[PDB]
Ligand binder design. Structure first.
Ligand SMILES: *[C@@H]1O[C@H](CO)[C@@H](O[C@@H]2O[C@H](CO)[C@@H](O[C@@H]3O[C@H](CO[C@H]4O[C@H](CO[C@H]5O[C@H](CO)[C@@H](O)[C@H](O)[C@@H]5O)[C@@H](O)[C@H](O[C@H]5O[C@H](CO)[C@@H](O)[C@H](O)[C@@H]5O)[C@@H]4O)[C@@H](O)[C@H](O[C@H]4O[C@H](CO)[C@@H](O)[C@H](O)[C@@H]4O)[C@@H]3O)[C@H](O)[C@H]2NC(C)=O)[C@H](O)[C@H]1NC(C)=O
Ligand code: NAG
Ligand code: NAG
Ligand code: NDG
Lengths: 572, 167
């Protein structure tokens, strides 16, 4: 019935493809990032997803159990499937906290991101809130209080820490309470995001200069299409959104009937996830193009006002459509006065704004706050959108935490020493203590680091190990025979070829290209807020941050080889 | 510097410059700035001076449209006006009192021309937007406290039920 479809939609629709995807798409030029994602979907999404589902269905065990039954000296990879997920639990719930914050500032008629604060004379506006948008100032100063550079970090901000604590308490409450009622919850917690996205798409398409963002997002610029970073980010994002590497898919498949269809389920899930991500990108980039058009018009109006004031023209004589002609006429009239203010005139174009209108880890929040502030009843839409986003984040965190706790739940020794219910509380407390780091002044930089690297290489390596083990270690013919015995209609040659020599080769090639690009450039830099310029400036990563990122990647990557060496020693 | 300029004068330090943008505040349906609009503006300035001298200094001074002298009119509608004595042109009202008078009755001048504090710039008299009145503290803290209290109560109830089931 429709219950299965709703469950598939809920498993496919998560906070990931709604939040992370627009930010990556804007970072990597829009279409130049969108084109690989579709390419990386039909090549890496469906085949690997179906492989994981088939493995989970056939083995009838958990991730650790399945990867131990496949091979002893490989079982440690299952442990890695927990560690990466743990790292996700380190920071992912932090997003929920931000949502909580943006919810709590949604019951006021003077919305905090709607009106800029006064400078102090009650005569103008703050320089930071004037150079940047009100939403951007609210995000970077009144919400994160971010420092200009990562080197200087202040104390733990108390309000973000309290928001994170509340988010963790809600997560723990949902863990304790919700165990099997989700079948009813799927009836409501799966269609609300689509309705909210439809409403916001309508609002965006009703805004002036909205088609520019859609054109930018669908423009496949070949200049930036060759960047390997775009391919790497697309691959890791699709793996994260589909849940590959985390092992939750295997656990879910182990709970289904042996005769349950898997190819159809995997294809439907992958297509729904891709379509939802594309729809969210469409809405977000429509609003983003609206922002870029507004900034371009404001810049043109400022330039025209300055020229009119300094040359005493008519009020309506100078317009956007005839700016450069008037500039040439003024230069030909008296070049001395024109040159007296020539450096003051700014060259602003749609392309530059669309490239640098709004960027960073909080692109979705800023964009949707801007969209909300141009509504009729702003508070209602703000509450609805933030409630939807918080619900998606809560569902994703519940899934991740269940996937983490399942190997711990299966631990007989741990269960015999402590109550099962206290394990969830201990895990939540430890995760909150670790994630309180992101609540500092410079915690946003650490959040960006753990969003860019805590799942980029680890997921790719886990997927590569899993597909190699399935294709060559266990034996492709044996796996196909087992699947045919279980359900019939053996895998088509397309899936066999993709599992054998397409996906691993593409993963290896992408990893090699990324490593070569990093070695050649050697200039891994992060965006940092600049209040004086009111923009984002690229700054080189410090040594300690690079070492921390390397350690975070290395632990997950070496979790499997270390256990393999241990198993080899035990055998010998 | 050799030469001289035909735009400076010892009394130019008492001049107040006015800049008006009709087609930006009104867009269409905007009147043209002919001599009648200048007469109306001078009458409004004289009225403001009368109001200031009556409501502050308690002096009844009979200003008129001839006592607000205007020069340097430009197609931008940006000129320099200074207010003199009622019949003693050699006497010029100091700029501080003129600025105070304009501040006192700027709303009336804005209303007379259907402009609002941005298309009628006096270049030296900057308006004040107004303090953003604040609730007692805010609403985020109260809602956060209510939500966390409800969450704690629910978690305690769930823990009690689980303990009872395990007992
Ligand atoms: C229309 O408006 C105009 C103004 O725009 C107005 O004309 C003014 O009228 C007044 C009143 O008559 C004039 O003031 C007179 O000045 C006479 C000249 O002698 C003085 O001149 C200088 C004035 O400076 C004053 O203020 C400064 C600063 O406050 C102060 O330091 C001075 O002491 C003085 O009070 C002044 O520089 C000058 O200085 C002498 O002494 C120094 C040494 O200190 C020396 O170095 C100088 O060389 C010089 O010798 C001198 O003080 C003055 O005679 C006169 O005083 C008599 O009359 C008043 C009444 O009018 C009596 O009260 C007083 O006791 C004296 O008997 C008075 O001070 C002003 O100069 C005019 N300004 C202009 C521009 O014209 C018109 O009247 C208005 N018309 C209408 C119809 O309304
Ligand atoms: C506000 O008042 C102070 C007073 O010293 C002044 O320095 C400052 O320039 C004023 N602000 C603006 C925007 O002019
Ligand atoms: C704008 O373009 C002109 C034309 O060459 C150039 O001289 C100037 O540096 C550019 N930037 C600004 C801010 O004017
Ligand atoms: C702005 O402030 C000034 C004094 O600071 C006050 O006189 C004026 O009425 C204010 N204008 C408003 C609140 O519109």
């Amino acid at each position: 019935s429709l219950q299965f479809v709703f469950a598939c939609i809920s498993y496919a629709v998560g906070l990931g493809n709604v939040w992370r995807f627009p930010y990556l798409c804007q970072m990597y030029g829009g279409g130049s990032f969108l084109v690989p994602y579709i390419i990386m979907l039909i090549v890496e999404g469906m085949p690997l997803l179906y492989l994981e589902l088939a493995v989970g269905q056939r083995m009838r065990q958990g991730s650790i159990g399945a990867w131990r039954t496949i091979s002893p000296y490989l079982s440690g990879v299952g442990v890695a499937s927990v560690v990466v997920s743990f790292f996700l639990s380190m920071y992912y719930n932090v997003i929920n906290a931000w949502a909580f914050w943006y919810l709590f500032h949604s019951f006021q008629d003077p919305l905090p991101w709607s009106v800029c604060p006064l400078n102090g004379n009650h005569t103008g506006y703050d320089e930071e809130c004037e150079k940047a948008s009100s939403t951007q100032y609210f995000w970077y100063r009144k919400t994160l209080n971010i420092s200009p550079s990562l080197q200087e970090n202040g104390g733990v901000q108390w309000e973000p820490a309290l928001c994170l604590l509340l988010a963790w308490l809600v997560v723990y409450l949902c863990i304790l309470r919700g165990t099997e009622s989700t079948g009813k919850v799927v009836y409501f917690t799966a269609s609300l995001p689509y309705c909210v996205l439809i409403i916001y798409l309508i609002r965006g398409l009703t805004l002036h200069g909205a088609t520019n963002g859609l054109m930018y997002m669908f423009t496949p610029k070949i200049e930036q299409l060759a960047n390997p970073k775009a391919w790497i980010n697309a691959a890791t994002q699709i793996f994260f959104s589909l849940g590959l590497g985390f092992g939750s898919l295997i656990a879910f498949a182990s709970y289904n009937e042996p005769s349950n269809n898997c190819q159809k389920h995997a294809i439907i899930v992958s297509l729904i996830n891709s379509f939802t991500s594309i729809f969210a990108s469409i809405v977000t980039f429509s609003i983003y193009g609206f922002k870029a058009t507004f900034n371009y018009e404001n810049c043109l109006k400022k330039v025209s006002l300055l020229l009119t004031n300094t040359f005493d023209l008519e009020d309506g004589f100078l317009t956007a459509s005839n700016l450069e002609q008037v500039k040439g006429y003024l230069a030909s009239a008296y070049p001395s006065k024109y040159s007296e203010m020539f450096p003051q005139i700014k060259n602003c174009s749609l392309e530059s704004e669309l490239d640098t209108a709004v960027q960073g880890t909080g692109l979705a929040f800023i964009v949707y706050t801007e969209a909300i502030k141009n509504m009729e009843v702003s508070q209602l839409w703000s509450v609805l959108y933030f409630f939807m986003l918080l619900m998606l984040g809560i569902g994703s965190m519940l899934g991740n935490t269940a996937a983490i706790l399942t190997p711990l739940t299966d631990s007989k020794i741990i269960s015999s020493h402590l109550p099962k219910e206290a394990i969830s509380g201990l895990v939540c407390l430890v995760n909150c203590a670790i994630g309180m780091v992101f609540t500092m002044e410079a915690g946003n930089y650490w959040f960006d680091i753990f969003n860019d690297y805590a799942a980029t290489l680890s997921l790719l390596l886990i997927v590569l190990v899993e597909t190699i083990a399935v294709c060559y270690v266990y034996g492709l013919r044996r796996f196909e025979s087992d699947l045919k015995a279980m359900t019939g209609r053996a895998v088509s040659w397309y899936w066999k070829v993709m599992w054998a020599g397409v996906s691993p080769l593409l993963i290896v090639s992408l990893f090699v290209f990324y490593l070569s690009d990093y070695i050649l450039t050697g200039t891994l830099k992060y965006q940092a807020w600049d209040a004086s310029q009111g923009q984002l400036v690229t700054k080189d990563y410090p040594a300690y941050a690079l070492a921390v990122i390397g350690l975070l990647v290395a632990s997950s990557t070496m979790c499997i080889p270390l256990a393999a060496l241990g198993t080899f020693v035990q055998r010998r | 510097f050799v030469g001289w300029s035909t735009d400076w004068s010892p009394y130019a330090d008492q001049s107040i410059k006015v800049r008006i943008s009709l087609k930006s505040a009104l867009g269409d349906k905007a009147y043209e700035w002919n001599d009648n609009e200048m007469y109306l503006f001078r009458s409004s300035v004289a009225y403001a001076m009368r109001q200031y001298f009556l409501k502050v200094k308690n002096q009844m001074i009979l200003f008129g449209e001839e006592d607000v002298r205007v020069a340097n009119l430009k197609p931008r509608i940006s000129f320099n006006f200074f207010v003199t004595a009622p019949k003693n042109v050699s006497d010029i009202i100091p700029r501080t009192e003129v600025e105070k008078a304009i501040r006192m009755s700027r709303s009336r001048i804005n209303d007379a021309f259907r402009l609002n504090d941005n298309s009628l710039e006096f270049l030296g008299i900057q308006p004040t937007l107004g303090p953003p009145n604040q609730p007692p503290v805010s609403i985020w803290l109260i809602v956060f406290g209510v939500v966390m209290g409800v969450i704690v109560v629910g978690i305690v109830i769930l823990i009690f039920t689980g303990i009872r089931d395990r007992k």
